[PDB]
Amino acid sequence: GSGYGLGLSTRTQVTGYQFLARRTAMALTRWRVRMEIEPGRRQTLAVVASVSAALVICLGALLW
Amino acid sequence: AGMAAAAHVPHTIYSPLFRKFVEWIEYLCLMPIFPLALWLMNVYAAIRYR
């Protein structure tokens, strides 16, 4: 009980946890949770796009 | 390290994202066995130099 250990988990629970984390992170920096727009994700995707763009140029150079 | 993990894992809590991550390690380990064993048996070089 109490969720101790390393038991398996459902994909619904994975996004469930990940949602509560985003909401709490927003509370520490913006002191509000209305979240009319969610800038937390938008700022993260721009980083993922930069890393992905860099790797694509490496594949191009490796293929050359 | 095994004894250390054996003593601490049963009384701690881990979030769903980490439990899902330890699960996928098994599948990531199974997939490379066949491609690697055939490489060790030299099959890819044997066929390419038929």
PDB file of all heavy atoms in Angstrom, chain A residues 2-11 13-14 17-18, chain B residues 9-20 23-24:
ATOM      1  N   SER A   2       0.187   2.414   0.043  1.00  0.00           N
ATOM      2  CA  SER A   2       0.828   3.725   0.058  1.00  0.00           C
ATOM      3  C   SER A   2       1.733   3.969  -1.147  1.00  0.00           C
ATOM      4  O   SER A   2       2.520   4.919  -1.139  1.00  0.00           O
ATOM      5  CB  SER A   2       1.612   3.944   1.354  1.00  0.00           C
ATOM      6  OG  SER A   2       0.749   3.907   2.476  1.00  0.00           O
ATOM      7  N   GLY A   3       1.653   3.140  -2.183  1.00  0.00           N
ATOM      8  CA  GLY A   3       2.481   3.346  -3.359  1.00  0.00           C
ATOM      9  C   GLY A   3       3.979   3.208  -3.188  1.00  0.00           C
ATOM     10  O   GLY A   3       4.727   3.798  -3.966  1.00  0.00           O
ATOM     11  N   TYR A   4       4.446   2.464  -2.194  1.00  0.00           N
ATOM     12  CA  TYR A   4       5.877   2.288  -2.025  1.00  0.00           C
ATOM     13  C   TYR A   4       6.439   1.356  -3.097  1.00  0.00           C
ATOM     14  O   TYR A   4       5.711   0.608  -3.748  1.00  0.00           O
ATOM     15  CB  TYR A   4       6.206   1.717  -0.653  1.00  0.00           C
ATOM     16  CG  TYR A   4       5.912   2.626   0.517  1.00  0.00           C
ATOM     17  CD1 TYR A   4       5.355   3.876   0.336  1.00  0.00           C
ATOM     18  CD2 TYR A   4       6.210   2.225   1.810  1.00  0.00           C
ATOM     19  CE1 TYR A   4       5.107   4.698   1.402  1.00  0.00           C
ATOM     20  CE2 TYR A   4       5.976   3.045   2.876  1.00  0.00           C
ATOM     21  CZ  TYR A   4       5.417   4.278   2.670  1.00  0.00           C
ATOM     22  OH  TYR A   4       5.138   5.080   3.750  1.00  0.00           O
ATOM     23  N   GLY A   5       7.756   1.405  -3.266  1.00  0.00           N
ATOM     24  CA  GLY A   5       8.442   0.560  -4.228  1.00  0.00           C
ATOM     25  C   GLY A   5       8.361   1.021  -5.674  1.00  0.00           C
ATOM     26  O   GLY A   5       8.005   2.155  -5.984  1.00  0.00           O
ATOM     27  N   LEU A   6       8.712   0.094  -6.572  1.00  0.00           N
ATOM     28  CA  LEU A   6       8.756   0.319  -8.015  1.00  0.00           C
ATOM     29  C   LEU A   6       7.706  -0.430  -8.841  1.00  0.00           C
ATOM     30  O   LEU A   6       8.045  -1.085  -9.827  1.00  0.00           O
ATOM     31  CB  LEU A   6      10.156  -0.028  -8.517  1.00  0.00           C
ATOM     32  CG  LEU A   6      11.284   0.862  -8.006  1.00  0.00           C
ATOM     33  CD1 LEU A   6      12.643   0.379  -8.458  1.00  0.00           C
ATOM     34  CD2 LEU A   6      11.080   2.257  -8.525  1.00  0.00           C
ATOM     35  N   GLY A   7       6.439  -0.352  -8.450  1.00  0.00           N
ATOM     36  CA  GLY A   7       5.375  -1.010  -9.188  1.00  0.00           C
ATOM     37  C   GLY A   7       5.093  -0.374 -10.543  1.00  0.00           C
ATOM     38  O   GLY A   7       5.420   0.776 -10.800  1.00  0.00           O
ATOM     39  N   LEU A   8       4.480  -1.149 -11.439  1.00  0.00           N
ATOM     40  CA  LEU A   8       4.166  -0.663 -12.780  1.00  0.00           C
ATOM     41  C   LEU A   8       3.142   0.467 -12.720  1.00  0.00           C
ATOM     42  O   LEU A   8       2.454   0.658 -11.716  1.00  0.00           O
ATOM     43  CB  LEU A   8       3.635  -1.797 -13.647  1.00  0.00           C
ATOM     44  CG  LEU A   8       4.667  -2.748 -14.237  1.00  0.00           C
ATOM     45  CD1 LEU A   8       5.313  -3.574 -13.158  1.00  0.00           C
ATOM     46  CD2 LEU A   8       3.994  -3.654 -15.232  1.00  0.00           C
ATOM     47  N   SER A   9       3.043   1.231 -13.813  1.00  0.00           N
ATOM     48  CA  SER A   9       2.095   2.339 -13.861  1.00  0.00           C
ATOM     49  C   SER A   9       1.501   2.583 -15.241  1.00  0.00           C
ATOM     50  O   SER A   9       2.149   2.365 -16.269  1.00  0.00           O
ATOM     51  CB  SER A   9       2.755   3.631 -13.404  1.00  0.00           C
ATOM     52  OG  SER A   9       1.807   4.676 -13.382  1.00  0.00           O
ATOM     53  N   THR A  10       0.242   3.032 -15.230  1.00  0.00           N
ATOM     54  CA  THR A  10      -0.558   3.344 -16.410  1.00  0.00           C
ATOM     55  C   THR A  10      -0.215   4.704 -17.008  1.00  0.00           C
ATOM     56  O   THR A  10       0.162   5.634 -16.302  1.00  0.00           O
ATOM     57  CB  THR A  10      -2.033   3.349 -16.040  1.00  0.00           C
ATOM     58  OG1 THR A  10      -2.338   2.180 -15.274  1.00  0.00           O
ATOM     59  CG2 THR A  10      -2.908   3.385 -17.272  1.00  0.00           C
ATOM     60  N   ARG A  11      -0.348   4.805 -18.336  1.00  0.00           N
ATOM     61  CA  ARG A  11      -0.065   6.050 -19.056  1.00  0.00           C
ATOM     62  C   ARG A  11      -0.973   7.202 -18.618  1.00  0.00           C
ATOM     63  O   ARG A  11      -0.581   8.365 -18.719  1.00  0.00           O
ATOM     64  CB  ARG A  11      -0.114   5.810 -20.559  1.00  0.00           C
ATOM     65  CG  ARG A  11       0.456   6.955 -21.369  1.00  0.00           C
ATOM     66  CD  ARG A  11       1.052   6.512 -22.711  1.00  0.00           C
ATOM     67  NE  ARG A  11       2.397   5.932 -22.569  1.00  0.00           N
ATOM     68  CZ  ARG A  11       2.768   4.672 -22.814  1.00  0.00           C
ATOM     69  NH1 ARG A  11       1.879   3.710 -23.009  1.00  0.00           N
ATOM     70  NH2 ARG A  11       4.054   4.375 -22.821  1.00  0.00           N
ATOM     71  N   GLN A  13      -1.879   7.744 -15.515  1.00  0.00           N
ATOM     72  CA  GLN A  13      -1.216   8.210 -14.302  1.00  0.00           C
ATOM     73  C   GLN A  13       0.043   9.015 -14.610  1.00  0.00           C
ATOM     74  O   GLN A  13       0.376   9.935 -13.864  1.00  0.00           O
ATOM     75  CB  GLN A  13      -0.869   7.044 -13.390  1.00  0.00           C
ATOM     76  CG  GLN A  13      -2.050   6.409 -12.698  1.00  0.00           C
ATOM     77  CD  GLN A  13      -1.635   5.302 -11.755  1.00  0.00           C
ATOM     78  OE1 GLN A  13      -0.469   4.940 -11.688  1.00  0.00           O
ATOM     79  NE2 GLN A  13      -2.584   4.765 -11.022  1.00  0.00           N
ATOM     80  N   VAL A  14       0.764   8.685 -15.674  1.00  0.00           N
ATOM     81  CA  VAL A  14       1.970   9.429 -16.034  1.00  0.00           C
ATOM     82  C   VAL A  14       1.627  10.870 -16.403  1.00  0.00           C
ATOM     83  O   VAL A  14       2.284  11.804 -15.933  1.00  0.00           O
ATOM     84  CB  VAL A  14       2.729   8.712 -17.159  1.00  0.00           C
ATOM     85  CG1 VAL A  14       3.882   9.536 -17.633  1.00  0.00           C
ATOM     86  CG2 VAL A  14       3.257   7.408 -16.641  1.00  0.00           C
ATOM     87  N   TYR A  17       0.349  12.854 -13.102  1.00  0.00           N
ATOM     88  CA  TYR A  17       1.436  13.370 -12.271  1.00  0.00           C
ATOM     89  C   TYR A  17       2.092  14.585 -12.907  1.00  0.00           C
ATOM     90  O   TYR A  17       2.290  15.613 -12.259  1.00  0.00           O
ATOM     91  CB  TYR A  17       2.482  12.278 -12.087  1.00  0.00           C
ATOM     92  CG  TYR A  17       3.768  12.758 -11.473  1.00  0.00           C
ATOM     93  CD1 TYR A  17       3.878  12.982 -10.118  1.00  0.00           C
ATOM     94  CD2 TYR A  17       4.891  12.959 -12.262  1.00  0.00           C
ATOM     95  CE1 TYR A  17       5.052  13.422  -9.575  1.00  0.00           C
ATOM     96  CE2 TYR A  17       6.060  13.401 -11.723  1.00  0.00           C
ATOM     97  CZ  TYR A  17       6.134  13.630 -10.385  1.00  0.00           C
ATOM     98  OH  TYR A  17       7.311  14.062  -9.843  1.00  0.00           O
ATOM     99  N   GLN A  18       2.416  14.480 -14.180  1.00  0.00           N
ATOM    100  CA  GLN A  18       3.082  15.524 -14.945  1.00  0.00           C
ATOM    101  C   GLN A  18       2.256  16.809 -15.015  1.00  0.00           C
ATOM    102  O   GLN A  18       2.820  17.892 -15.154  1.00  0.00           O
ATOM    103  CB  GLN A  18       3.412  14.961 -16.315  1.00  0.00           C
ATOM    104  CG  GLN A  18       4.545  15.626 -17.000  1.00  0.00           C
ATOM    105  CD  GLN A  18       5.012  14.828 -18.189  1.00  0.00           C
ATOM    106  OE1 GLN A  18       4.424  13.805 -18.533  1.00  0.00           O
ATOM    107  NE2 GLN A  18       6.098  15.268 -18.802  1.00  0.00           N
TER     108      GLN A  18
ATOM    109  N   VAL B   9      14.959   0.759  -1.344  1.00  0.00           N
ATOM    110  CA  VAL B   9      13.808   0.786  -2.253  1.00  0.00           C
ATOM    111  C   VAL B   9      12.483   0.384  -1.625  1.00  0.00           C
ATOM    112  O   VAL B   9      11.470   1.013  -1.944  1.00  0.00           O
ATOM    113  CB  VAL B   9      14.116  -0.031  -3.512  1.00  0.00           C
ATOM    114  CG1 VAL B   9      12.887  -0.108  -4.373  1.00  0.00           C
ATOM    115  CG2 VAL B   9      15.211   0.618  -4.299  1.00  0.00           C
ATOM    116  N   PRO B  10      12.387  -0.620  -0.759  1.00  0.00           N
ATOM    117  CA  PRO B  10      11.066  -0.967  -0.226  1.00  0.00           C
ATOM    118  C   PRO B  10      10.402   0.065   0.675  1.00  0.00           C
ATOM    119  O   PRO B  10       9.192  -0.069   0.889  1.00  0.00           O
ATOM    120  CB  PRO B  10      11.321  -2.268   0.557  1.00  0.00           C
ATOM    121  CG  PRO B  10      12.477  -2.864  -0.092  1.00  0.00           C
ATOM    122  CD  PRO B  10      13.347  -1.647  -0.399  1.00  0.00           C
ATOM    123  N   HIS B  11      11.090   1.078   1.215  1.00  0.00           N
ATOM    124  CA  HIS B  11      10.403   2.027   2.091  1.00  0.00           C
ATOM    125  C   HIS B  11      10.337   3.458   1.557  1.00  0.00           C
ATOM    126  O   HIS B  11      10.033   4.368   2.331  1.00  0.00           O
ATOM    127  CB  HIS B  11      10.995   1.987   3.507  1.00  0.00           C
ATOM    128  CG  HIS B  11      12.377   2.544   3.648  1.00  0.00           C
ATOM    129  ND1 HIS B  11      13.481   1.743   3.837  1.00  0.00           N
ATOM    130  CD2 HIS B  11      12.832   3.819   3.670  1.00  0.00           C
ATOM    131  CE1 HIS B  11      14.560   2.496   3.945  1.00  0.00           C
ATOM    132  NE2 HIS B  11      14.194   3.761   3.857  1.00  0.00           N
ATOM    133  N   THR B  12      10.603   3.687   0.272  1.00  0.00           N
ATOM    134  CA  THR B  12      10.544   5.009  -0.352  1.00  0.00           C
ATOM    135  C   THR B  12       9.379   5.112  -1.331  1.00  0.00           C
ATOM    136  O   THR B  12       8.704   4.133  -1.628  1.00  0.00           O
ATOM    137  CB  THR B  12      11.846   5.338  -1.069  1.00  0.00           C
ATOM    138  OG1 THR B  12      12.296   4.194  -1.792  1.00  0.00           O
ATOM    139  CG2 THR B  12      12.888   5.730  -0.062  1.00  0.00           C
ATOM    140  N   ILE B  13       9.141   6.327  -1.825  1.00  0.00           N
ATOM    141  CA  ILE B  13       8.080   6.610  -2.786  1.00  0.00           C
ATOM    142  C   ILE B  13       8.718   7.099  -4.080  1.00  0.00           C
ATOM    143  O   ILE B  13       9.679   7.869  -4.049  1.00  0.00           O
ATOM    144  CB  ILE B  13       7.106   7.679  -2.256  1.00  0.00           C
ATOM    145  CG1 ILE B  13       6.297   7.147  -1.085  1.00  0.00           C
ATOM    146  CG2 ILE B  13       6.191   8.184  -3.366  1.00  0.00           C
ATOM    147  CD1 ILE B  13       5.531   8.220  -0.366  1.00  0.00           C
ATOM    148  N   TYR B  14       8.186   6.656  -5.216  1.00  0.00           N
ATOM    149  CA  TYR B  14       8.652   7.087  -6.527  1.00  0.00           C
ATOM    150  C   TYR B  14       7.473   7.492  -7.399  1.00  0.00           C
ATOM    151  O   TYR B  14       6.445   6.813  -7.430  1.00  0.00           O
ATOM    152  CB  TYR B  14       9.458   6.015  -7.231  1.00  0.00           C
ATOM    153  CG  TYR B  14      10.667   5.550  -6.480  1.00  0.00           C
ATOM    154  CD1 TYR B  14      10.575   4.573  -5.517  1.00  0.00           C
ATOM    155  CD2 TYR B  14      11.909   6.077  -6.750  1.00  0.00           C
ATOM    156  CE1 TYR B  14      11.693   4.092  -4.900  1.00  0.00           C
ATOM    157  CE2 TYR B  14      13.024   5.629  -6.098  1.00  0.00           C
ATOM    158  CZ  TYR B  14      12.910   4.634  -5.178  1.00  0.00           C
ATOM    159  OH  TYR B  14      13.997   4.280  -4.444  1.00  0.00           O
ATOM    160  N   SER B  15       7.624   8.615  -8.084  1.00  0.00           N
ATOM    161  CA  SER B  15       6.569   9.135  -8.932  1.00  0.00           C
ATOM    162  C   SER B  15       6.408   8.326 -10.221  1.00  0.00           C
ATOM    163  O   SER B  15       7.384   7.832 -10.778  1.00  0.00           O
ATOM    164  CB  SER B  15       6.841  10.589  -9.264  1.00  0.00           C
ATOM    165  OG  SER B  15       6.948  11.352  -8.073  1.00  0.00           O
ATOM    166  N   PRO B  16       5.181   8.222 -10.728  1.00  0.00           N
ATOM    167  CA  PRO B  16       4.871   7.450 -11.932  1.00  0.00           C
ATOM    168  C   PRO B  16       5.810   7.584 -13.123  1.00  0.00           C
ATOM    169  O   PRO B  16       6.034   6.624 -13.857  1.00  0.00           O
ATOM    170  CB  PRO B  16       3.469   7.955 -12.315  1.00  0.00           C
ATOM    171  CG  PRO B  16       2.835   8.216 -11.041  1.00  0.00           C
ATOM    172  CD  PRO B  16       3.958   8.797 -10.178  1.00  0.00           C
ATOM    173  N   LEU B  17       6.345   8.771 -13.340  1.00  0.00           N
ATOM    174  CA  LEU B  17       7.259   9.004 -14.453  1.00  0.00           C
ATOM    175  C   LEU B  17       8.555   8.216 -14.313  1.00  0.00           C
ATOM    176  O   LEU B  17       9.146   7.831 -15.321  1.00  0.00           O
ATOM    177  CB  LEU B  17       7.516  10.499 -14.586  1.00  0.00           C
ATOM    178  CG  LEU B  17       8.373  10.962 -15.742  1.00  0.00           C
ATOM    179  CD1 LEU B  17       7.729  10.598 -17.045  1.00  0.00           C
ATOM    180  CD2 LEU B  17       8.496  12.450 -15.648  1.00  0.00           C
ATOM    181  N   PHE B  18       9.031   7.997 -13.095  1.00  0.00           N
ATOM    182  CA  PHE B  18      10.244   7.207 -12.888  1.00  0.00           C
ATOM    183  C   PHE B  18       9.972   5.704 -12.980  1.00  0.00           C
ATOM    184  O   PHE B  18      10.771   4.963 -13.557  1.00  0.00           O
ATOM    185  CB  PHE B  18      10.874   7.571 -11.554  1.00  0.00           C
ATOM    186  CG  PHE B  18      12.180   6.895 -11.302  1.00  0.00           C
ATOM    187  CD1 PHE B  18      13.290   7.207 -12.050  1.00  0.00           C
ATOM    188  CD2 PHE B  18      12.299   5.955 -10.309  1.00  0.00           C
ATOM    189  CE1 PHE B  18      14.476   6.594 -11.816  1.00  0.00           C
ATOM    190  CE2 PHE B  18      13.484   5.336 -10.084  1.00  0.00           C
ATOM    191  CZ  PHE B  18      14.572   5.660 -10.834  1.00  0.00           C
ATOM    192  N   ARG B  19       8.843   5.243 -12.458  1.00  0.00           N
ATOM    193  CA  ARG B  19       8.467   3.833 -12.542  1.00  0.00           C
ATOM    194  C   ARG B  19       8.289   3.401 -13.995  1.00  0.00           C
ATOM    195  O   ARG B  19       8.708   2.312 -14.384  1.00  0.00           O
ATOM    196  CB  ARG B  19       7.230   3.570 -11.703  1.00  0.00           C
ATOM    197  CG  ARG B  19       7.537   3.806 -10.261  1.00  0.00           C
ATOM    198  CD  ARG B  19       6.490   3.324  -9.301  1.00  0.00           C
ATOM    199  NE  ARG B  19       5.391   4.241  -9.067  1.00  0.00           N
ATOM    200  CZ  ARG B  19       4.113   3.979  -9.302  1.00  0.00           C
ATOM    201  NH1 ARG B  19       3.722   2.796  -9.731  1.00  0.00           N
ATOM    202  NH2 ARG B  19       3.203   4.897  -9.043  1.00  0.00           N
ATOM    203  N   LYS B  20       7.669   4.244 -14.806  1.00  0.00           N
ATOM    204  CA  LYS B  20       7.546   3.987 -16.237  1.00  0.00           C
ATOM    205  C   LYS B  20       8.923   3.955 -16.895  1.00  0.00           C
ATOM    206  O   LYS B  20       9.141   3.194 -17.837  1.00  0.00           O
ATOM    207  CB  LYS B  20       6.686   5.073 -16.872  1.00  0.00           C
ATOM    208  CG  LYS B  20       6.415   4.948 -18.358  1.00  0.00           C
ATOM    209  CD  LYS B  20       5.770   3.660 -18.817  1.00  0.00           C
ATOM    210  CE  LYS B  20       4.445   3.403 -18.154  1.00  0.00           C
ATOM    211  NZ  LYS B  20       3.901   2.082 -18.539  1.00  0.00           N
ATOM    212  N   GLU B  23      10.844   0.591 -16.206  1.00  0.00           N
ATOM    213  CA  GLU B  23      10.221  -0.473 -16.989  1.00  0.00           C
ATOM    214  C   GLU B  23      10.799  -0.566 -18.395  1.00  0.00           C
ATOM    215  O   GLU B  23      11.150  -1.651 -18.858  1.00  0.00           O
ATOM    216  CB  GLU B  23       8.719  -0.252 -17.052  1.00  0.00           C
ATOM    217  CG  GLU B  23       8.010  -1.198 -17.964  1.00  0.00           C
ATOM    218  CD  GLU B  23       6.516  -1.099 -17.844  1.00  0.00           C
ATOM    219  OE1 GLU B  23       5.962  -0.010 -18.075  1.00  0.00           O
ATOM    220  OE2 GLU B  23       5.889  -2.117 -17.504  1.00  0.00           O
ATOM    221  N   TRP B  24      10.903   0.555 -19.092  1.00  0.00           N
ATOM    222  CA  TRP B  24      11.431   0.571 -20.455  1.00  0.00           C
ATOM    223  C   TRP B  24      12.888   0.127 -20.561  1.00  0.00           C
ATOM    224  O   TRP B  24      13.327  -0.222 -21.656  1.00  0.00           O
ATOM    225  CB  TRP B  24      11.246   1.949 -21.076  1.00  0.00           C
ATOM    226  CG  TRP B  24       9.949   2.015 -21.764  1.00  0.00           C
ATOM    227  CD1 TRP B  24       8.729   2.170 -21.196  1.00  0.00           C
ATOM    228  CD2 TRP B  24       9.727   1.838 -23.154  1.00  0.00           C
ATOM    229  NE1 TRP B  24       7.756   2.150 -22.158  1.00  0.00           N
ATOM    230  CE2 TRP B  24       8.349   1.933 -23.372  1.00  0.00           C
ATOM    231  CE3 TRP B  24      10.565   1.617 -24.243  1.00  0.00           C
ATOM    232  CZ2 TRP B  24       7.791   1.823 -24.631  1.00  0.00           C
ATOM    233  CZ3 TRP B  24      10.011   1.516 -25.485  1.00  0.00           C
ATOM    234  CH2 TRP B  24       8.640   1.614 -25.672  1.00  0.00           C
TER     235      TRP B  24
END
